[PDB]
Amino acid sequence: VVVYLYTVVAFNFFRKFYNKSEDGDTPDMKCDDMLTCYMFHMYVGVRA
Amino acid sequence: VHYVLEESSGYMEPTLRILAILHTII
């Protein structure tokens, strides 16, 4: 629940940061989707 | 710049509004 709260906050206020592009100019795995951003959080930010 | 609920075969966009209405009522 707390990670979902952080996810909605980031989706609403931080768009230009989740830019995990490889080799440059490949913007993907961003926060352009609520479920994608929630999975990214719960999978990377917890274990980081 | 525009938040959109484009993820299903309908029945998810109006249900959110009716659920918010029911939540405020309750």
Coordinates of N, CA and C in Angstrom, one line a residue:
Chain A
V1 N 0.8 -1.2 0.0 CA 0.0 0.0 0.0 C 0.9 1.3 0.0
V2 N 1.9 1.3 0.8 CA 2.8 2.4 0.9 C 3.5 2.6 -0.5
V3 N 4.0 1.6 -1.1 CA 4.6 1.7 -2.4 C 3.6 2.2 -3.4
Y4 N 2.4 1.7 -3.3 CA 1.4 2.3 -4.3 C 1.2 3.8 -4.1
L5 N 1.2 4.2 -2.8 CA 1.1 5.6 -2.5 C 2.2 6.4 -3.2
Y6 N 3.4 5.9 -3.0 CA 4.6 6.6 -3.6 C 4.5 6.5 -5.1
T7 N 3.9 5.4 -5.7 CA 3.8 5.3 -7.1 C 2.8 6.3 -7.7
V8 N 1.6 6.5 -7.0 CA 0.7 7.5 -7.5 C 1.3 8.9 -7.4
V9 N 2.0 9.2 -6.3 CA 2.7 10.5 -6.1 C 3.7 10.7 -7.3
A10 N 4.5 9.7 -7.6 CA 5.5 9.9 -8.7 C 4.8 10.0 -10.0
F11 N 3.7 9.2 -10.3 CA 3.0 9.3 -11.5 C 2.4 10.7 -11.7
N12 N 2.0 11.3 -10.6 CA 1.3 12.6 -10.7 C 2.3 13.8 -10.7
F13 N 3.5 13.6 -10.2 CA 4.4 14.8 -10.0 C 5.8 14.6 -10.6
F14 N 6.2 13.4 -11.0 CA 7.5 13.1 -11.5 C 7.4 12.3 -12.8
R15 N 7.4 13.0 -13.9 CA 7.3 12.3 -15.2 C 8.7 12.2 -15.9
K16 N 9.5 13.3 -15.9 CA 10.7 13.4 -16.6 C 11.9 12.8 -15.9
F17 N 11.7 11.9 -14.9 CA 12.8 11.3 -14.2 C 12.9 9.8 -14.6
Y18 N 11.8 9.1 -14.6 CA 11.8 7.6 -15.0 C 12.1 7.5 -16.5
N19 N 13.4 7.5 -16.8 CA 13.9 7.5 -18.2 C 15.0 6.4 -18.4
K20 N 14.7 5.2 -17.9 CA 15.7 4.2 -17.9 C 16.0 3.7 -19.4
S21 N 16.6 4.6 -20.1 CA 17.0 4.4 -21.5 C 18.4 3.8 -21.6
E22 N 18.6 2.8 -22.5 CA 19.9 2.2 -22.7 C 20.4 2.6 -24.1
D23 N 21.7 2.9 -24.1 CA 22.5 3.4 -25.3 C 22.0 4.8 -25.8
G24 N 21.1 5.4 -25.1 CA 20.6 6.7 -25.4 C 19.4 6.8 -26.4
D25 N 18.5 7.7 -26.2 CA 17.4 8.0 -27.1 C 16.5 6.7 -27.2
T26 N 16.4 5.9 -26.2 CA 15.5 4.8 -26.1 C 14.6 4.9 -24.9
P27 N 13.8 5.9 -24.8 CA 13.0 6.0 -23.6 C 12.0 4.9 -23.4
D28 N 12.2 4.0 -22.4 CA 11.3 2.9 -22.2 C 11.4 2.6 -20.7
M29 N 10.5 1.8 -20.2 CA 10.3 1.4 -18.8 C 10.1 2.7 -18.0
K30 N 9.3 3.6 -18.5 CA 9.1 4.9 -17.9 C 7.9 4.7 -16.9
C31 N 7.3 5.9 -16.5 CA 6.1 5.9 -15.7 C 4.9 6.3 -16.5
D32 N 4.9 6.0 -17.8 CA 3.8 6.4 -18.6 C 2.6 5.5 -18.4
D33 N 2.6 4.5 -17.5 CA 1.6 3.6 -17.2 C 1.5 3.4 -15.7
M34 N 0.4 3.4 -15.0 CA 0.3 3.3 -13.6 C 0.7 1.9 -13.2
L35 N 0.2 0.9 -13.8 CA 0.6 -0.5 -13.5 C 2.1 -0.7 -13.7
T36 N 2.6 -0.2 -14.8 CA 4.0 -0.4 -15.1 C 4.9 0.3 -14.1
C37 N 4.5 1.5 -13.7 CA 5.3 2.3 -12.7 C 5.2 1.6 -11.3
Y38 N 4.0 1.0 -11.0 CA 3.9 0.3 -9.7 C 4.7 -0.9 -9.7
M39 N 4.7 -1.7 -10.8 CA 5.6 -2.9 -10.9 C 7.1 -2.5 -10.8
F40 N 7.4 -1.4 -11.5 CA 8.8 -0.9 -11.4 C 9.2 -0.6 -10.0
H41 N 8.4 0.2 -9.3 CA 8.7 0.5 -7.9 C 8.8 -0.8 -7.1
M42 N 7.7 -1.6 -7.0 CA 7.7 -2.8 -6.2 C 8.8 -3.8 -6.5
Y43 N 9.4 -3.7 -7.7 CA 10.4 -4.6 -8.2 C 11.8 -4.1 -8.0
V44 N 12.0 -2.8 -8.1 CA 13.4 -2.2 -8.2 C 13.7 -1.4 -6.9
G45 N 12.7 -0.5 -6.5 CA 13.0 0.4 -5.4 C 13.0 -0.3 -4.1
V46 N 12.3 -1.4 -3.9 CA 12.3 -2.1 -2.7 C 13.6 -2.9 -2.5
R47 N 14.1 -3.5 -3.6 CA 15.3 -4.4 -3.6 C 16.6 -3.6 -3.8
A48 N 16.5 -2.3 -4.1 CA 17.7 -1.5 -4.5 C 18.6 -1.3 -3.4
Chain B
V1 N 0.7 14.8 -20.9 CA 0.2 16.0 -20.3 C -1.3 15.8 -20.0
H2 N -1.9 14.7 -20.5 CA -3.3 14.4 -20.4 C -3.4 12.9 -19.9
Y3 N -4.0 12.7 -18.7 CA -4.1 11.4 -18.1 C -5.3 10.7 -18.6
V4 N -5.1 9.5 -19.1 CA -6.1 8.7 -19.8 C -6.2 7.3 -19.3
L5 N -7.4 6.8 -19.1 CA -7.7 5.4 -18.7 C -8.0 4.7 -20.0
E6 N -7.0 4.2 -20.7 CA -7.1 3.5 -22.0 C -6.4 2.2 -21.8
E7 N -7.0 1.2 -21.1 CA -6.4 0.0 -20.7 C -7.3 -1.3 -20.8
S8 N -8.6 -1.1 -21.2 CA -9.5 -2.3 -21.2 C -10.5 -2.2 -22.3
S9 N -11.4 -3.1 -22.3 CA -12.5 -3.1 -23.3 C -13.8 -2.4 -22.7
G10 N -13.6 -1.2 -22.3 CA -14.6 -0.4 -21.7 C -15.0 -0.9 -20.3
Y11 N -16.1 -0.5 -19.8 CA -16.6 -0.8 -18.4 C -15.6 -0.5 -17.3
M12 N -14.7 0.4 -17.5 CA -13.8 0.8 -16.5 C -13.7 2.3 -16.3
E13 N -14.1 3.0 -17.3 CA -14.1 4.5 -17.3 C -15.4 5.0 -16.5
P14 N -16.6 4.5 -16.8 CA -17.7 5.0 -16.0 C -17.9 4.4 -14.7
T15 N -17.3 3.2 -14.5 CA -17.4 2.6 -13.2 C -16.6 3.3 -12.2
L16 N -15.5 4.0 -12.6 CA -14.7 4.8 -11.7 C -15.5 6.0 -11.2
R17 N -16.2 6.6 -12.1 CA -17.0 7.8 -11.7 C -18.2 7.4 -10.7
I18 N -18.9 6.3 -11.1 CA -20.0 5.8 -10.2 C -19.4 5.3 -8.8
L19 N -18.2 4.8 -8.8 CA -17.6 4.3 -7.6 C -17.2 5.5 -6.7
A20 N -16.7 6.6 -7.3 CA -16.3 7.8 -6.6 C -17.6 8.4 -6.0
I21 N -18.7 8.4 -6.8 CA -19.9 9.0 -6.3 C -20.4 8.2 -5.1
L22 N -20.4 6.8 -5.2 CA -20.8 6.0 -4.1 C -19.9 6.2 -2.9
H23 N -18.6 6.4 -3.1 CA -17.7 6.6 -2.0 C -18.0 7.8 -1.3
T24 N -18.3 8.9 -2.0 CA -18.6 10.2 -1.3 C -19.9 10.0 -0.5
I25 N -20.9 9.4 -1.2 CA -22.2 9.2 -0.5 C -22.0 8.4 0.8
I26 N -21.2 7.3 0.7 CA -21.1 6.5 1.9 C -20.2 7.1 3.0

